[PDB]
């Protein structure tokens, strides 16, 4: 209908086909096409499969869309790396698990243009720092 | 609140407050300014007030205590035939005497929980911090 651009940061499930709560008219109310995102986003979830990969969408006008599909915050393949499916109630009164430092090389090698750090120690210590609110204790530290 | 068993009855008088004008049990402490009386509910008030504010749960020291029986005659009789039945109970708080001590919370929590406390009382009041060191 119109031409008034938009910069929309969102978040969407991987291999499904979103119902009413997420999208619908959540980014299509400016002006975009849905037919080639139900069949164009659910096909690259045949790449990385089963984790909440983040999505960003920029909208021009008419029926135009240009999206980017980032890196899944492995709060899915780490919750499993313990024993609980739904995360800890309170990270300091009830815990989850204890990942190895080598399961900190799949969050520090999938996030190459995300964890805007230079070194490996930094890019590990980042989401290892995330690995504290999840309610998890680190099999790491000095020495060992 | 109320007590257990006793004498029954009373009277009244004033002139400054004995002890204990010192900050024990806590880091922060609220102190009366007027020769009041204080009632069971008047203090249970501040109990429930501050105990709202501190959440779970602080550490709260009610340094005062109702021991005084105050009466009122049955409403509508001409005097004589008796002394009034025991209406309510009273702590005879005199000035400089300290009513509330708390800690296990910060300075802001003392200021505020004491503010809300003192907005429930017949007295102007001052809150402060320790140093009264004759005996801890």
């Amino acid at each position: 209908m119109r031409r008034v651009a938009g910069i929309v940061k969102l978040q969407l499930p991987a291999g499904k086909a979103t119902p009413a709560p997420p999208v619908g008219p959540a980014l299509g109310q400016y002006g975009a096409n849905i037919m080639e995102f139900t069949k164009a986003f659910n096909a690259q979830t045949a790449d990385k499969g089963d984790a909440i990969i983040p999505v960003e969408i920029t909208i021009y006008a008419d029926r135009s869309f240009t999206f980017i599909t980032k890196t899944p915050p492995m709060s899915y393949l780490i919750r499993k790396a313990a024993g609980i499916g739904k995360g800890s109630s309170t990270p300091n009164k009830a815990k989850v698990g204890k990942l190895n430092w080598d399961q900190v090389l799949e969050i520090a090698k999938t996030k190459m243009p995300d964890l805007n750090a230079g070194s490996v120690e930094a890019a590990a210590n980042t989401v290892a720092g995330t690995a504290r609110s999840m309610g998890v204790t680190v099999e790491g530290g000095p020495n060992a | 609140k109320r007590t257990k068993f006793r004498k029954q009855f009373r009277g009244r008088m004033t002139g400054d407050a004995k002890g204990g004008d010192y900050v024990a049990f806590g880091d922060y402490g609220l102190i009366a300014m007027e020769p009041a009386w204080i009632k069971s509910n008047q203090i249970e008030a501040c109990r429930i007030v501050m105990s709202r504010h501190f959440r779970r749960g602080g550490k709260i020291y009610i340094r005062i205590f109702p021991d005084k029986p105050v009466t009122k005659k049955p409403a509508e009789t001409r005097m004589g035939k008796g002394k009034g039945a025991v209406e309510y109970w009273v702590s005879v708080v005199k000035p400089g005497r300290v009513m509330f001590e708390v800690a296990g919370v910060t300075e802001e929590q003392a200021k505020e929980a004491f503010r809300l406390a003192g907005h429930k009382l017949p007295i102007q009041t001052k809150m402060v911090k320790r140093e009264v060191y004759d005996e801890a």
Partner: protein, 175 residues
């Protein structure tokens, strides 16, 4: 510190802001009066184990630890001070505030760092090398552990006038 007067009549001061006074050497005892300002300053600086000097308006510097303070219960300011002029080698039974050190593991599971004795009556280091405070690590304590006067530390050459089993700083449960 420094005074000027020592009579029985206090109109030389008071309004002019000085504190009623005594200080005894134990063979030498003297009444006097010392300006409020300085006394408050130093006494919160140095307190009940402070030790400080008395250069009377005459010229006779003295060695003074602070012994007893007595204050206007209403206005809540001090009006009088008892001193103890220190001797030499043997002193007295110093009163010293227990503190707490480190982020304790006792406050991570809902508990609280409660000092069941804010102040400690020890015995004698020597009246020139006195502990001002104390340092009781609390980290090892969980919820339900107390610290008796045995577990309390020492700096060497000192003894504890307090029963070695009564409770100083103990963690309390939540709510």
């Amino acid at each position: 510190m420094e005074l000027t007067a020592k009579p029985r009549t206090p109109k030389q001061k008071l309004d002019e802001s000085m504190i009623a006074a005594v200080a005894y050497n134990k063979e030498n005892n003297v009444s006097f009066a010392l300006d409020r300002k300085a006394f408050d300053r130093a006494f919160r600086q140095q307190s009940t184990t402070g030790l400080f000097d008395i250069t009377v308006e005459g010229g006779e510097t003295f060695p003074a630890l602070v012994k007893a303070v007595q204050m206007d219960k209403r206005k809540r300011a001090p009006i009088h001070v008892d001193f103890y002029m220190v001797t030499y080698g043997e002193p007295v039974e110093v009163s010293v505030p227990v503190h707490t050190t480190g982020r304790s593991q006792g406050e991570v599971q809902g508990g609280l760092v409660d000092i069941v004795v804010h102040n400690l009556q020890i015995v004698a280091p020597g009246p020139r090398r006195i502990p001002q405070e104390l340092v009781v690590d609390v980290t090892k304590m969980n919820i339900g552990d107390h610290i008796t006067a045995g577990d309390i530390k020492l700096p060497e050459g000192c003894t504890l006038a307090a029963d070695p089993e009564l409770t100083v700083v103990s963690v309390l449960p939540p709510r």
